[PDB]
Each structure stands twice: as structure tokens, then as C-alpha cells.
Design an enzyme around this catalytic site. Sequence first.
Site, PDB file in Angstrom:
ATOM      1  N   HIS A 111       0.691   9.646   5.443  1.00  0.00           N
ATOM      2  CA  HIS A 111      -0.251  10.138   4.451  1.00  0.00           C
ATOM      3  C   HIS A 111      -0.653  11.572   4.764  1.00  0.00           C
ATOM      4  O   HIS A 111      -0.752  12.378   3.851  1.00  0.00           O
ATOM      5  CB  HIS A 111      -1.502   9.257   4.404  1.00  0.00           C
ATOM      6  CG  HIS A 111      -1.226   7.845   3.997  1.00  0.00           C
ATOM      7  ND1 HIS A 111      -1.604   6.759   4.749  1.00  0.00           N
ATOM      8  CD2 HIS A 111      -0.562   7.347   2.954  1.00  0.00           C
ATOM      9  CE1 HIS A 111      -1.214   5.649   4.151  1.00  0.00           C
ATOM     10  NE2 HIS A 111      -0.578   5.983   3.057  1.00  0.00           N
ATOM     11  N   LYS A 145      -6.359  -6.170  -3.517  1.00  0.00           N
ATOM     12  CA  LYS A 145      -6.289  -6.880  -2.248  1.00  0.00           C
ATOM     13  C   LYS A 145      -7.376  -6.348  -1.300  1.00  0.00           C
ATOM     14  O   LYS A 145      -7.546  -5.132  -1.176  1.00  0.00           O
ATOM     15  CB  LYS A 145      -4.843  -6.667  -1.782  1.00  0.00           C
ATOM     16  CG  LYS A 145      -4.385  -7.518  -0.630  1.00  0.00           C
ATOM     17  CD  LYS A 145      -3.161  -6.975   0.099  1.00  0.00           C
ATOM     18  CE  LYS A 145      -3.038  -7.598   1.456  1.00  0.00           C
ATOM     19  NZ  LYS A 145      -1.869  -7.116   2.191  1.00  0.00           N
ATOM     20  N   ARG A 184       8.524   6.732  -1.524  1.00  0.00           N
ATOM     21  CA  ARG A 184       9.179   6.154  -0.360  1.00  0.00           C
ATOM     22  C   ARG A 184      10.500   5.493  -0.766  1.00  0.00           C
ATOM     23  O   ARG A 184      11.553   5.907  -0.291  1.00  0.00           O
ATOM     24  CB  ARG A 184       8.201   5.194   0.335  1.00  0.00           C
ATOM     25  CG  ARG A 184       8.671   4.686   1.695  1.00  0.00           C
ATOM     26  CD  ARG A 184       7.547   4.118   2.569  1.00  0.00           C
ATOM     27  NE  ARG A 184       6.657   3.162   1.892  1.00  0.00           N
ATOM     28  CZ  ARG A 184       5.312   3.190   1.844  1.00  0.00           C
ATOM     29  NH1 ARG A 184       4.597   4.100   2.507  1.00  0.00           N
ATOM     30  NH2 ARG A 184       4.675   2.292   1.105  1.00  0.00           N
ATOM     31  N   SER A 221       0.547   1.610   5.804  1.00  0.00           N
ATOM     32  CA  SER A 221      -0.671   1.025   6.336  1.00  0.00           C
ATOM     33  C   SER A 221      -0.435  -0.450   6.668  1.00  0.00           C
ATOM     34  O   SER A 221      -0.677  -0.885   7.791  1.00  0.00           O
ATOM     35  CB  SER A 221      -1.834   1.171   5.380  1.00  0.00           C
ATOM     36  OG  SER A 221      -2.309   2.509   5.308  1.00  0.00           O
TER      37      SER A 221
END
Lengths: 159, 173
Positions: free
Chosen positions: B32, B56, B105, B143
Amino acid sequence: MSTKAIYPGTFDPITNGHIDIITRAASMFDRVILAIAASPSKKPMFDLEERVALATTALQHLPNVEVMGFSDLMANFARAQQANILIRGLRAVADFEYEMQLAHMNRHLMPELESVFLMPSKEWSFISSSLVKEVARHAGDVTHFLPANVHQALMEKLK
Amino acid sequence: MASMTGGQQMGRGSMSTKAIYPGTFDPITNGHIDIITRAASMFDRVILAIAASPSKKPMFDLEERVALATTALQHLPNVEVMGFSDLMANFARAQQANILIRGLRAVADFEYEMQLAHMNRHLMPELESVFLMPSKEWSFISSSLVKEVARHAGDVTHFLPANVHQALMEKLK
């Protein structure tokens, strides 16, 4: 301070989709060079001079944009032009993989050059140079996908 | 020429840039930090926008997320960190941003990314989405993955700044 971006391609010929990408890029970077590959591995319909002439006319109205041919390693061209940004349009999933590969190589070759990706507008999301040529070769109407100067140039090539 | 025109964004050269880079950042990783460092190098100002109420339930609350990130990015003068609880297009509009930063990504994401960009064009025409590939170093981290490795005692010191690594170790007893 300054941002200077390179938008490289074969641009054989330049379409409205390319024009959209570079209009968007030129709004975010001080200067942008449309970099036209001199010697693409597959021989183009339009030679470099024609490809460059067409693109110049089509982009003449954008004050901070300049159209140039190039025949060397992109790292060397960007270094020669003092560019610090590389712009790519990102149409297809297939293209993403390849572009991520070149980006990594370009990071190795020229760390100070950042690669940047823009998605195409929904209007231009299915057009490519290749497709428009194919359609136009069998007399399909492609007036919507090209600027007038390019359109007339393509018609001439097919007659 | 102000008394004639305030000016348009398109076809008139380069304009002030202000970007938002939204996410849950639960917690912020080196991946990040790399993305925002790159974006901060090319745009005048960058706001790291942290989502207040992701679907979530996050390991770190908003306050913790914002504090860790603020610390991690304090060496970038043109970056600021804010929480937000809106659509990313609404926040952009409130914040007078014209650029939306998205990390890219995986191939599996691309379709989704394109679709969200079309939605954001529809919501806010003047907002341009810009896509950055992650560095090869951070290409396989997230993460979520760093959390799950860390839970079972894997070494993740390479992937996080020190402040985050410490906070994470505390969360896992």
C-alpha cells in the site's frame, strides 16, 4: 514539479479510443508524447510518416501533446525525452498480463519511470486498430470509431 | 481571463491533481505504501481514504487503521489520511478530488476494476480512475494474507512498517 508522460503504441491507425486515453492523460500530466513505434514486428498498414501525420492532425487541438516516432528501447527514448511516466490504455484482460510483464522489465531497465494504466471509456471499450481495419476491409461502417482525417486515409488505403 | 471563463478540465493542458486512494487498509502494508508513494510522486496531493465500515469486520477499528497509516506515511509531505463512510465517488466529490487511485494486482480483478470504473464515471464524470501495478516485491501480499501468516507465527516483518508490525503482534496476543 513537471510531469512528462509517454503514450507508446503502433497507432496503425489512431482511433477515437486512443484519442480518449491521451485527452485524459494530457489533463493530468504537464506534457504527453504520443510515441509511435517505427518498426513494429508485424508490418503496419500505414508507414511511420503516415501514422505520425494522422495522429498529429487528430491531436493538434491538445496544447500539451506532441507526436513522435521512435525506434529504440522505450527506456532510452523516455530517458532521452526526460519523461518520468509511461501511459498505457488497458482494454483487455489478455493485455493486462503482458503489460504487467513489460512494466516489471521497464522497472529493471529504468527505475525512475512509473508506468500508469487507464481503462478505456465504455464507448471505446471494444474497438482496436485491428478490428476497425478488419470491419472496414469488408465495407463495414466505422465512421463512429475514427476522426475524419484518419477515416478518409483508411478509405483511400482500401481503394 | 477569469471574467470571461473559469476554465474547463479537458483540452486545455495540465490541471492541479488531487487523488484519493481508498481501501480498508486493515492494516496498511508495504504494498500500500509503495502504491501511494508512487502516486504521490506524480499527483499534487493524495488522500489515503480508509473505509469506516467494510462489509467484513476488520481486525483493526477505523481509529487504529487511521493512526497506523498516518504514522506510516508521515514522511510523504503531500499525502493525508482520512476515514470515510460513503461511496468512493461521493468522498472524491466532497474532497474536490479528480483522480481515483486503484492498485491492480491480479487478472481476476481486472473485469471488476473496469466495471467499478464505469460506475464511477457514471456517478462522477470528472473523476478519472488511474491504475498502478504493485512492485514485484509486494505483488503476492495482501493485508489478509499477512494477518493469516502472522496468526500462526509466520515471519511478516518484511511486509509491514515497524509500527504496523508491532500493532499486529499485539492483536494476536
